[PDB]
Design a binder for this molecule. Structure first.
Ligand SMILES: Nc1ncnc2c1ncn2[C@@H]1O[C@H](COP(=O)(O)OP(=O)(O)OP(=O)(O)O)[C@@H](O)[C@H]1O
Ligand SMILES: [Mg+2]
Lengths: 790, 40, 439
């Protein structure tokens, strides 16, 4: 009771001190007795408000440290550790944003690792803050960290194992080196792919420390090649990728590099040999007949132009290199054809034959992280079903079916060429997010959970995504509901919205390219866009989703449950894609489960409002709430199910954001989430922008992406966030004033302009959030491939 | 997943003949349909 | 998948273009599925149905043997290289390469399919001649890498792992079973290829060859064969079922080693000298006299009457085989310490007819079956002389007079139990087997 008494009294002092610091004018607003009672209670006597705030914090730290000291004699000791730990962490952040905080970075590390020793969840999720605080305070904590993380159970790090192997080339590797090798001893398959993906980027420095790091990494690489089975599995999966697509990606990552003169041929030759090792040299590690046919058609021309060696392309010719690649690609996008038997493209997967005591190919993504692993029940690969189905997209990924040893069949979506680490960490954020949603009463009683699917990056330019079965994408659902008159009249008719919109954009601008928006945002006033939007809105049938669910269901209770599940799941992913700020939510990026009705969100390219920052035509909406989603709930208005789901989920997040803001922080502070990766990501996508006509690197600075996210989780107007975010990306745009004028609203037609900028509440914020996403002035002048009329 | 076939390389029905090749354990002729072949 | 072929073989064999494209691809994976069926339990009959399917496909191949080995563009089986054609000879080479694979029944079917398929090839030579050709033109150690090398894929087997020490980790029981099955596969293929003549005995395990069969069998008999106390292969806690499977697998490799040495003696007469440095010493002879005098101490089971109907003839042919050898005296010196005269005057002095008197009557039946089997070998008068007067035999009537006055009144009567009849039938059969004595 003494320990809990001191926890509570320290929390009281912390609440008062955080209250006076948020607005230090309410202290001179309340009462002459109340102000004097606060000024007495801190003990400091200055009447300056800054010293009385620091004195309140000192009393809070005194009481909480007394609680930690009293806690050293399961549910009540780790609470005492975590209150002091997150208090000193919050103080440290309040210093590091802009001599009292001296003994804090030792204290956070010590008490947080002690809590993680005692099977905590809130200390397990707040662990990468320690590896972030090690670098920024290396004097107080580099050997303390090591001697305390030594005696911590090795499987507590599996969820954050992709940070340690990236830390393993630093000045502070010794603080993690014990747990990495303990993981390699106990559970080797939990570290294999994050080790492989981080061996690509080490750059070991030249000290007595860096050489020991190189010795340690070589030791772990010797320990992880159990027969070299995984590199065969990765290579045979890498066979399942279109070769003209790998060539076009190589043209991308050679052209941009070669445009930087004095081009410095050292990395260019490495890029070329990595091209020729897979698309060149035919006597290869085990290619199949697909890649073999490709090489026999186009391997002789790769030294006719680029030279044996590769020093023949070193006459950079930055226009004529594109001429070479176009001369290739004109044939290349015709001659290839994706094969549909697994023996025709990957003989190692065709001839699997799990061997007589060699190893085990565990099916990837099975160490989630929490609890003891117990890999006796993990699924191992017995063989691959010989039916590969190609999806119909530009970056067409193949679908394989892995027959696991436990009587069952698992389908996966193998896609090569792109970096899946962003998708994996967004899914990890969703795990944190609907772990928060489960520990809330009003959300668990509604049973609100985001549908998560596992994403595994094997290496760069190759990864496996779990296949979600009996699902179909939303645009395919809407287009399969349509009758052959509605369907073909929507697809081939010049008065249909996908053809009328382009005419209306020429009618406003004059041109036929993406520069039409930088003239239509200024040239078209508010009533023209709204009226033209309704005229191209009423051409699609009014109730496609209701007819989809009617012909999808067989009884009125079935229809009611399908529509209620669609509504709840879509409102949850609408409010949870805005907190992260995920953009480019067109109709193919949603997938609806045909046997249950729920919505799944896929394809997380744009992470933190980079849709409304970096695209040429920005996307000024929080989420997808077009006319179908609100005709489905008719006769009930928009105060119905979706509004209460959004309000309940937003309140559940904004109750305690300490867990969420830290995880968004360690996601956005990753070096692999940077401008080089985003630039090379949107290049192989077509999408809204085709090239970069920017001034220097477009100024990606993640200092304030999370400042925006903390503002919107603390209470902000959402349209204030949109102007604040396109101010970072569109100030040198010719239509910046009209972008802000469109996003801000009217003070006449919209609730988002009739509110303050900040200090909002949950009902109010979702009110002006649903107002923005349904604004016809916003939907009428947004991107043409987004299809806002649906 | 159905088997998509192999990538390419680089008076109605026949009647029941009574004469076999393989012995049992321990130009062909055609006919038409006789009312129990197909469903009615 | 096997039930669906055992119904349609009758029609699938009745079309040429359907059988001159599909038969090799069918046979290869039906072998592979039978190899996968090694793991499951012997009640589902999946092994039975795959052997039925393989025999149906084999009779199909046997009929149309003239058109199959003609080089034609057929449909390739899994694991096969890309070729301009396919013949039967490549299938024979696939069968020969998949000879020493660890899975039992698939190894058996692969061996016998090879033997059925070295005929029906264009020139019709015997398997002696064709393998001599391929051993003239591919090296003798290729064949040793097929026999010894388990399967073909991973470079493994007892050529890679001669002792269980090289297969080391934390102790897993199933891994020792993998090693035993690899050794058992090499034993079976060596034993079959030397028995059905087809190879020279002295020119496979000889001059300059890493034939790690003899190293493996020496390590097996040195420490592993005798004392399956299963701790003998750990260097925790054992269950009966983990131990019973171990004893079954341990017994059925001892049996195949006994048949292998039998074939090695009966095939090459001057190749006795190979099995001198390792085999004919305390190890193999200790196991053999142990199996003769009491097999259940070594790890067998009495309930399986089938293996108790196979153990007589294997030890009989083994004792008969080195009867005509320089190892007759090592046989005699290892038999004439557990089988002596006082060894039977000891056991002839128990109280036989009591209602609980299995105090040596349990261990009498082992010596009774031992002398029955020694007599059927034909060496009973070699190990037991006539030490009374003459050809008028001492114990050959003393056992008769024993069981005679054993059912004398005088305590009132001996009334008989269950194992008394089994013992007495054995004593009578040994007494009658001693020679003559019908009068
Ligand atoms: N996790 C998944 N489970 C099942 N199907 C999926 C999954 N992810 C994608 N798909 C299917 O694959 C198709 C294309 O996926 P992907 O997102 O890789 O394509 P893309 O090249 O990004 O194009 P788009 O953005 O139009 O989807 C989707 O339309 C969807 O039907
Ligand atoms: Mg997508």
């Amino acid at each position: 009771a003494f320990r809990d008494q001191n926890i509570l009294l320290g929390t009281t002092y912390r609440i008062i001190a955080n209250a006076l610091s948020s607005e230090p004018a309410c202290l001179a607003e309340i009462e002459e007795d109340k102000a004097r009672r606060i000024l007495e209670l801190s003990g400091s006597s200055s009447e300056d408000s800054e010293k009385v705030i620091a004195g309140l914090y000192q009393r809070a730290f005194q009481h909480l440290s007394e609680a930690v000291q009293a806690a050293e004699e399961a549910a009540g000791v780790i609470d005492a550790y975590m209150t002091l730990a997150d208090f000193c962490d919050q103080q440290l952040r309040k210093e590091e944003e802009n001599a009292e905080l001296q003994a804090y970075p030792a204290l956070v590390v010590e008490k947080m690792l002690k809590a993680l020793k005692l099977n905590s969840n809130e200390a397990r999720l707040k662990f990468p803050r320690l590896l972030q605080i090690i670098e920024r305070y290396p004097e107080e904590t580099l050997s303390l960290m090591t001697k305390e993380i030594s005696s911590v159970p090795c499987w507590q790090f599996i969820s954050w194992i992709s940070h340690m192997v990236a830390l393993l080339d630093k000045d502070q590797a010794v603080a993690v080196q014990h747990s990495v090798e303990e993981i390699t001893d106990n559970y080797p398959q939990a570290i294999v792919y994050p080790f492989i993906i981080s061996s690509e980027s080490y750059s070991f420095k030249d000290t007595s420390t860096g050489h020991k790091n190189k010795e340690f990494v070589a030791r772990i690489k010797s320990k992880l090649d159990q027969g070299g089975v995984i590199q065969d599995f990765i290579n045979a999966l890498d066979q399942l990728s279109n070769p003209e697509l790998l060539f076009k990606d190589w043209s991308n990552d050679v052209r941009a590099e070669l445009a930087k003169t004095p081009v410095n041929k050292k990395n260019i030759e490495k890029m070329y040999e990595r091209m020729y090792a897979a698309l060149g040299d035919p006597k290869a590690p085990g290619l199949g007949a697909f890649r073999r046919k490709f090489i026999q058609t186009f391997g002789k021309e790769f030294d006719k132009h680029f030279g044996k060696g590769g020093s023949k392309l070193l006459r950079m010719k930055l226009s004529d290199f594109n001429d070479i690649t176009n001369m290739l690609l004109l044939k290349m996008n015709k001659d290839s054809k994706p094969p549909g038997n697994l023996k025709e493209c990957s003989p190692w997967m065709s001839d699997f034959k799990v061997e007589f005591l060699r190893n085990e190919l565990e099916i990837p993504g099975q160490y989630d992280g929490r609890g003891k692993p117990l890999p006796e029940y993990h699924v191992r690969i017995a063989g691959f079903d010989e039916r590969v189905t190609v999806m119909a997209s530009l970056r067409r990924p193949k679908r394989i079916i892995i027959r696991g040893h436990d009587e069952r069949e698992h389908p996966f979506l193998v896609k090569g060429g792109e970096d899946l680490r962003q998708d994996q960490r967004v899914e990890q954020l969703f795990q944190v997010m609907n772990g928060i949603l489960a520990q809330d009463s009003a959300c668990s009683q509604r049973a609100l959970q985001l549908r998560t699917y596992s994403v595994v990056p094997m290496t760069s330019r190759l990864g496996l995504i779990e296949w979600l079965e009996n699902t179909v994408t939303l645009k395919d659902l809407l287009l399969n509901t349509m009758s052959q008159e509605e369907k073909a009249a929507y697809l081939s008719d010049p008065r249909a919205p996908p053809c009328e919109y382009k005419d209306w954009l020429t009618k406003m601008s004059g041109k036929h390219d993406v520069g039409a928006y930088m003239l239509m945002y200024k040239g078209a006033n508010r009533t023209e866009t709204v009226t033209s939007f309704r005229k191209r809105e009423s051409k699609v049938p009014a109730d496609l989703l209701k007819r989809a669910f009617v012909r999808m269901s067989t009884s009125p209770e079935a229809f009611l449950a399908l529509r209620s599940h669609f509504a709840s799941s879509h409102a949850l992913i609408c409010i949870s894609h805005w907190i992260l700020g995920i953009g480019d939510r067109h109709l193919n990026n949603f997938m609806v489960a045909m046997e249950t009705g729920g919505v799944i969100g896929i394809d997380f390219g744009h992470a933190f409002g980079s849709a409304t920052q970096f695209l040429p035509v920005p996307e000024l909406m929080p989420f997808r709430l077009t006319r179908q989603f609100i005709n489905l709930m008719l006769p009930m208005k928009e105060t119905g199910l979706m509004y209460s789901i959004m309000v309940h989920a937003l309140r559940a997040f904004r109750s305690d954001p300490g867990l969420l803001t830290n995880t968004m922080d360690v996601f956005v502070k990753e070096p692999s989430f940077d401008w080089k990766n985003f630039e090379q990501k949107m290049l192989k996508k077509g999408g809204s922008w085709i090239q970069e006509i920017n001034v220097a690197e477009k100024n990606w600075y993640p200092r304030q992406k999370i400042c925006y996210a903390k503002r919107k989780l603390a209470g902000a107007n959402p349209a204030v966030i949109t102007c604040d975010e396109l101010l970072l990306g569109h100030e040198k745009a010719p239509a910046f004033r009209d972008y802000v004028a469109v996003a801000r609203g009217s003070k006449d037609h919209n609730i988002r302009a009739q509110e303050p900028e900040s200090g909002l509440s949950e009902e109010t914020q979702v009110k002006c959030l649903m107002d923005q996403a349904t604004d016809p002035n916003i939907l009428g002048r947004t991107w043409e491939g987004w299809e806002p009329w649906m | 997943p159905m088997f998509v076939e192999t990538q390419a390389s680089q008076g109605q029905i026949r009647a029941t003949q009574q004469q076999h090749d393989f012995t049992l354990t321990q130009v062909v002729l055609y006919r038409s349909y006789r009312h129990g072949d197909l469903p009615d | 998948a096997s039930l669906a072929f055992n119904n349609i073989y009758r029609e699938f064999r009745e079309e040429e273009s359907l059988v001159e494209q599909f038969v090799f691809e069918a046979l290869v994976i039906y072998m592979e599925s039978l190899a996968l069926a090694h793991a499951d339990e012997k009640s589902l009959g999946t092994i039975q149905q795959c052997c039925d399917a393989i025999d149906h496909l084999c009779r199909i191949i046997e009929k149309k043997h003239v058109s199959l080995n003609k080089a034609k563009k057929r449909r390739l089986p899994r694991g096969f290289p890309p070729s301009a054609s396919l013949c039967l000879l490549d299938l024979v080479k696939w069968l020969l390469a998949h000879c020493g694979r660890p899975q039992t029944e698939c190894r058996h079917k692969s061996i016998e399919l090879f033997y059925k398929f070295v005929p029906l090839l264009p020139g019709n030579r015997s398997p002696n001649l064709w393998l001599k050709d391929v051993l003239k033109e591919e090296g003798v150690s290729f064949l040793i890498n097929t026999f010894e090398g388990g399967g073909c894929g991973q470079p493994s087997g007892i050529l890679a792992q001669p002792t269980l020490l090289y297969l080391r980790g934390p102790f897993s029981l199933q891994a020792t079973l993998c090693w035993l099955d690899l050794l058992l596969a090499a034993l079976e293929c060596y034993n079959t290829f030397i028995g059905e003549r087809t190879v020279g005995a002295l020119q496979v395990l000889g001059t300059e060859a890493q034939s790690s069969l003899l190293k493996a069998v020496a390590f097996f008999l040195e420490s592993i064969a005798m004392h399956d106390i299963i701790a003998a292969e750990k260097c925790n806690r054992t269950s009966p079922q983990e131990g019973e499977r171990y004893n079954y697998s341990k017994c059925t490799v001892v049996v195949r080693i006994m048949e292998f040495t039998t074939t090695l003696l009966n095939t090459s007469p001057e190749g006795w000298k190979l099995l001198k440095k390792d085999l004919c010493n305390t190890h193999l002879m200790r196991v053999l006299v142990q199996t003769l005098c009491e097999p259940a101490s070594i790890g067998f089971n009495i309930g399986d009457v089938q293996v108790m109907a196979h153990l007589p003839d294997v030890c009989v042919n083994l004792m008969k085989a080195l009867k005509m050898s320089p190892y007759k005296d090592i046989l005699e010196t290892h038999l004439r310490e557990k089988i002596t005269a006082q060894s039977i005057e000891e056991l002839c002095a128990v109280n036989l007819y009591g209602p609980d008197a299995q105090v040596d009557r349990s261990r009498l039946a082992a010596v009774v079956s031992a002398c029955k089997q020694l007599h059927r070998a034909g060496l009973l008068h070699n190990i037991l002389p006539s030490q009374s007067t003459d050809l008028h035999h001492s114990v050959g009537t003393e056992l008769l007079s024993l069981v005679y006055k054993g059912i004398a009144p005088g305590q009132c009567l001996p009334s008989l139990d269950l194992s008394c009849k089994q013992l007495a039938s054995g004593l009578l059969e040994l007494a009658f087997a001693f020679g003559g004595l019908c009068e």
